[PDB]
Symmetry: D2
Subunit: 384 residues, 4 copies
C-alpha cells in the first residue's frame, strides 16, 4: 500500500457573507487556490492526474464546477475532474478519496479540497418549468435548502446544535466562553502572521481598479463575554445558540496537492505531512475510528483542528473525546474564521498542516461534521 | 489487489420530459433502485459500507441527495454517502470509484450508480440574494445551465455534436438511419421482455390511485426513416442534428451493488460480472486505453453499450474504434431510451450486464461522453 | 346638463382560466372589442375624444394598457387614454366617468369599458431589486394579490362571501340552487343565440391555423343539483362556498361607445339606451341610491344584471333590494359565464343593454361589488 | 359650470432610488400626504367625497392602491377610491378628473394626486403560472416595463428623448447647461426654504429607532458644467442624454384637496388657486390648447412648471412655446428633484401652487409628458 502525502496546502482568505468575496465565483476561488497549490508543491500543471473538489451550492454554477476551476487554473483540459457533495464533509472527503485512488494504483498526483461561495447562492423557483397554476409559493433560498437544512427533520442545522446542547447539557455560558476563546486565538493568530504562509491572495479586477483580498474577514476583534452574553438566540425562543457562538455563512477555497510518497521523491518535492489514516475504512465514532486506525490515541496528538460550526457541537465532541483544549484550534476556529461549507474541511486541513510545520508538531487530527455517517476525519504525521 | 464484482444491477424505467416520472424526485427514484439492488444482490442493507451516487441537477434537492436516497431506501443512517457530479460521466464514474475504494482496502460493499430528474429541475434567480439593482435579467433554466451548456464555449452540447458531425462528415442521413435502428432495437427489446430483469417498478400514489411506472416511455414505436427526414435541425440553421437523432431530457435512477470478490463469496452472493478495467486507471483514448488495460481488443468484445447522446457522436466513436455495430446497443440506445444525465452511465452499465447474462456474452464494454478528460468506460467479464 | 347615451356595446367571449384566451393579452382583447364597438356605433375612430378602460392585473403589461388597446385598435395615436383600477368596480366605473366628463362639457364621444386576462397574470419577486438577503420568501401570485385578496383583512375575497352567507343565513343549498339556475339560463341563452349580437370573435393565429374564439366557454352545460352538492367547500372547513357556487378566473374585454345625445344625433347614430343615473352621484346603498336618483323603484325595473362573483353575495343583494328573480340575469350570470375582474362591470352592462334591446325592456339596472365605497351601479332607459 | 379650486397641496419629499424612502410603500407615502392635505385644507375626513390617485407601478401593491392610501390616511371606509394609470400623466390627470366630476355635479370635495415608489418595484416572472417548459427567459424589471419602456417602438423612453434632441437639434452642451441651471435653482430653493410649506415629513419607525425624511434627496449640490460634461451617455453610443441631464428614478406622493368654490366658501376654506383650464377639453398642442382655453397667452403667465424628465424634452417644449425661462421651474425641476412617475404631475402642481402663493404670481401653468395624447397641462389663477 502506497504512502500518501500532502505536497502543498493553500487557501484563499475566508470572506464574510455579502462582503469581500461576494463578486468572486466559487470556481474562481478554486482556480486561484489550485494554481498556487501546484506552484507551492513545485510541480507542473502537467504532473496532476485528477482534480477532485468539494462544492455544495452547485446551483447555476454550470457544468462540473471542479472542471471549471481546473481549467481556469491552467491545468490541461484533458485532466479529469469531478465535483463532490457531502455537505459538511465535502472538502475533507476529497482528500481521503485522493488517497484511495493513489492507494488503488490509479494516480500519483491529485488536486483535492473544496470551494464555496455562499454569498452568491441563487434563489429558486421549483415549479417554474411546468407552472405553479395558482397561489403563492416559496421563492427558495438555495443556500439554506442545499447547505443548511436537515432534509429529514425539516429544520435548520441550528436546531440540531440546540438539541446537542440540551443532550450534553452545554450551557449558553460555556458556549460563549468557547466562542470568545476562538475569537481571541484567531485575533492573535492573524496579527502574529500564522496564516500568512497558507493564504493565497485573491485579486479582484474592477472596471476601474484592483482590490486584493488576503485576510480573513470574519473574526470580531475585541470580542467580549458581555458582548456575547447580550446576543439574542438565533434558532429558537430561549435558545442557547446565537450568531455569536455559531459560525457564519462564508466564502473560500482550500486546495491541497496529494501525492504518493514515491512520486513526491521522484519529483523532488519535500512533503509537508503524510496522511496516516482517515474516517473512511458514542456518536463520534468516525473520529475515534480514524485515531485507532492510525494506531494512535487522543493523548498522543500534538495539534487538533475540530471544526466549530456550533460551539455546542465542538464542546460535545471535545468532552466525549477528552481533548486537551490547549491543542485544539490553536489559531482560532470557525466561530471566528467562518464556515464555507464545501471548502471547510479542506480549510481546516490546510490550517492544521501549516500549524504543524510552524510549531513542529508531529501528530495532527482534523475532524468535522457530527452524526452517523457524516463525520469526516484525517490523521497527519509531519514529515521530518 | 482485490478483484471487484457487480452483485446486482437495477434501474427504474426511463421517463420522458414532463411525463411519467414528473412527480417523482430524483432521490425517490434513487431510493427505489437502491432498495431493490440490495434485495437482488441478496445482502442485507447493513452489509453496505458506503453509497456513491451521481446526480447533476442538484439544485434545491436538499442536503446530500445521495444521502437522502440512501436513507429513503432504508439503509442504516450511519452509512456514509456522497453525491458525485461529473455531468455526463457521473453515474459510471461512481462505479470505478467504488472499485478504487475496494482496491484501496477501505470497503467491501458499495452502492454505486446515479439518479436524475430533469423534468423537475428549477429555474434560478442568481442575483436575488443581494439584488438585481435595475434592468431585465435572466430567469435561468437550471437544467440547461448545469447539465447541457458548455461552460467554456458558451454554447449547448448540441453544438458540439454538430461540430463532430461536421468534422467527420457524419451526414444527416447517416445519423437518421442510426436513430431508426436504435428505435427499432428498443421497441423489440421492450416487447420481447429484455428489460424485465433490470427494471424496478416505481409506485406513484395519486390522490385516488397508485400508478405503477415500469416501462421505458421515450421510444417512438413505429418510427420511420421518412418521419425522421422531415424533422428540422434543432441547434443550427441547415444543421444535421435534430430531435429525432438526439436523445431527450429524461428521468431515471440506476444502481449497482459493487463488492470485493472475497466478500461476495463470504456472503454467498452469486455475482453477475467482474470489473476488469476502467477509464480512470484519437480523442476517445479513454475508452481505447481502458480496452488495452483489460488485455483485450475491440474485436474480442461480445457486447458494447456506447451511449447515444447524439447519433453524430455515437457514429464518430464507433467509426474510430471500429465497433461491429451488431454488438452495439443491442437493446436500443439513448436516442430511443433517453439520456437522464446523472444516471445514464449507470443505466447503460445496468443494461450491459443484464444483456451479457441473457445473451451469454463474456466480454462487455460500457462507454459514454466524448472529449479529453470526459470519456468514462468500464470493461466487464461475465462470471461463470 | 347633457343627456348621455350608449351608442354600441361589444364584448369578447369570456374564456376560462388557462384555456381559450390564454394566449391573447388583455390589450389585444381590448383592441378587438374597441375596433368593433366603434364600427357598431357607426362612427369613425377619429370621432373618439378619449379612452377609459378598466384593467386590474396591470403588472408587466407595459405602459398604459388602455393606451395600448386604443392604438392596437387603430384609434388615432393622439386620443388620450387612461387605465382605471377599482378592482371589481373598474369596468362599470369607466362608464360613469365617461358620462361625468361628457356632462362637464369636455367630451362628446368616449370609449369605455374594461379588459382582463387573468390566465396571463405574472408571478412576482418583490425583493429582487435590492435583495432578499437570506431566508425563503414568497413567490407571489399577482392575480391573487392584486385582484382577489382583501388588503385590510388579509384574506381571500371568498372569505367575505362566506361571511355574508353566515350573517344572512344563505345556505349551501340555496347557493347551489342559485348556481344551477345561472348555469341553466346561460346554457339556454348561448344555445338560443342571445349573445350573438354582443360577442366579437377573437382571432388567434397559431403556428398553422387561425383559431376563432366566439363562444363563452365557462358554462358547465348539463349541470345538476347533485353535481353541485358533491363539491367541497373552497375557502373554509365546513364552508358553504364552493367552485360550483362561485365564479371563476376569466379573460374578457367589454367596450361601449358612450356619447352625448346631441353628438349621437349629429353623427346619425341610433343609440341603444340612455344612461339615467349611476352609483357615483342597507350596505347596498349605492345601488339603492342610484335607483332612487333615476326616479324609479326596484319594481319598475324590467331587467337586472346583478353580478354573480359569489352566489352568497348575489342572493344577499337580491334579498335586500327585493329583486324579482325572473328579471335577474336572464341570460345567466357570472357563476356560469365567468368573472374577468377588470372587464366584468362592463361585461354585464353589455349583456344588459342587448338583452333590453331584444326583449323590449325599458328600464334596466346593472350592479356589482358589495361593501361601502365599492358598489358600482348604472340605470339605463332604452331608446325608442 | 361650477368653479373649482385647490384647497391644499402637499407632498412628501422626493426620495432617491434605493435610498431614503426605500422602506416606505407608495400607499403609505400616499396616506401620509392625504392625511396632511385634509388637515391643511381645514376640513374633516368626512368632508371628502372621493379619492382619485395616480400610481403607475401597481404590481403587487394589492387591491386598489388608492383605496389603501385612503384607508391608511383615516378617511371613512365608505369613500370611493380609484387608482389611475396614465404613466407620466397620471398625477395631473387625477386633478382634472376631479374637476370634471365636480363640474358634472357629482362631488364637492375630492382628494387627487399621485404616489409612486420606484425603489420598491418588483421583478416579474411572466410565464410562471403555466410554465416556461424549457430555456432561459426574462426576469422582468417591472419598473422599466410598466413605467419606462415604449410599448410600441420597443425601446427606452430615453431613446425618444435622444430623437427629440436630434429633431430639434438640441446639443449635449445646451442640455447640460439646462441641467446645471435646474441643479442650481433647486439648491437655492431648498436652502432658502421654498419647499418647507409644501413638504410633509415621513416618519419611518424602525424596530430600534425613528428616522424623519423631510428633504428632497436627489439634487446634486455643487454641480458643475465640467462634472456634467464628463458624463457618459445613458441610452446609446455617442448619445447626448446622460444621467446628468435626465431625471432619476424616485419615490414620492403628492396630494391636493380639490373642491367646488361653493363648498370651499361653505366650509370656511381659503383656497390657494382656481383651476382655470386643463388639457382635457406642433406636437405640444395639449399645452397650447389648455392655455387658449384659459383665454390666456404664454406671455401672460407668471410662473411655469414644465417637467424635466429629460433636458432635451424640456428644451424642445420651451423653444416651441417660447417660454420666458426666468419663469420656468423657479425652484428647480425634475433633473435635480426627481421624477416619481405616478406622482410627478401632482408634485409639480403642488410646487406651482406654493410658489404662486410665495411669489404673488397670479397666473400659473403646469405641464408634463410629450407626444400626441400624452401631454397633460393645467392652468391656475391665484385666489386673491
Amino acid at each position: 500500500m502506497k504512502e500518501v502525502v500532502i505536497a502543498s496546502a493553500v487557501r484563499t482568505a475566508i470572506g464574510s457573507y455579502g462582503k469581500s468575496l461576494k463578486d468572486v465565483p466559487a470556481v474562481d476561488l478554486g482556480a486561484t487556490a489550485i494554481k498556487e497549490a501546484v506552484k507551492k508543491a513545485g510541480i507542473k500543471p502537467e504532473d496532476v492526474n485528477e482534480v477532485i473538489l468539494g462544492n455544495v451550492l452547485q446551483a447555476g454554477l454550470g457544468q462540473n464546477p471542479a472542471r471549471q476551476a481546473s481549467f481556469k487554473a491552467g491545468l490541461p483540459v484533458e485532466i479529469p475532474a469531478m465535483t463532490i457533495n457531502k455537505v459538511c464533509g465535502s472538502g475533507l472527503r476529497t482528500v481521503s478519496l485522493a488517497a484511495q485512488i493513489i492507494k488503488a494504483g490509479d494516480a500519483d498526483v491529485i488536486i483535492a479540497g473544496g470551494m464555496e461561495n455562499m454569498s452568491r447562492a441563487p434563489y429558486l423557483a421549483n415549479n417554474a418549468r411546468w407552472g405553479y397554476r395558482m397561489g403563492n409559493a416559496k421563492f427558495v433560498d438555495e443556500m439554506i435548502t442545499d447547505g443548511l437544512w436537515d432534509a429529514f427533520n425539516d429544520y435548520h442545522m441550528g436546531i440540531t446544535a440546540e438539541n446537542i446542547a440540551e443532550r450534553w447539557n452545554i450551557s449558553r455560558e460555556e458556549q460563549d466562553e468557547f466562542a470568545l476563546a476562538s475569537q481571541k486565538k484567531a485575533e492573535e493568530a492573524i496579527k502574529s502572521g500564522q496564516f500568512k504562509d497558507e493564504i493565497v491572495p485573491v485579486v479582484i479586477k474592477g472596471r476601474k481598479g484592483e482590490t486584493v483580498v488576503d485576510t480573513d474577514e470574519h473574526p470580531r476583534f475585541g470580542s467580549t463575554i458581555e458582548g456575547l452574553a447580550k446576543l439574542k438566540p438565533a434558532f429558537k425562543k430561549d435558545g442557547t445558540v446565537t450568531a455569536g457562538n455559531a459560525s457564519g455563512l462564508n466564502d473560500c477555497a482550500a486546495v491541497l496537492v496529494i501525492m504518493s510518497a514515491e512520486k513526491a521523491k521522484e519529483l523532488g518535492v519535500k512533503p509537508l505531512a503524510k496522511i496516516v489514516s482517515y474516517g473512511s475504512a458514542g456518536p463520534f465514532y468516525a473520529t475515534k475510528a480514524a485515531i485507532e486506525k492510525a494506531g494512535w490515541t487522543v493523548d498522543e496528538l500534538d495539534l487538533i483542528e475540530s471544526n466549530e460550526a456550533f460551539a455546542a457541537q465542538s464542546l460535545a465532541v471535545a468532552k466525549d473525546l477528552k481533548f486537551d483544549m490547549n491543542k485544539v484550534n490553536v489559531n482560532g476556529g470557525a466561530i471566528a474564521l467562518g464556515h464555507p461549507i464545501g471548502a471547510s474541511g479542506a480549510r481546516i486541513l490546510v490550517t492544521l498542516v501549516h500549524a504543524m510545520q510552524k510549531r513542529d508538531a508531529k501528530k495532527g487530527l482534523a475532524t468535522l461534521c457530527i452524526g452517523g455517517g457524516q463525520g469526516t476525519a484525517i490523521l497527519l504525521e509531519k514529515c521530518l
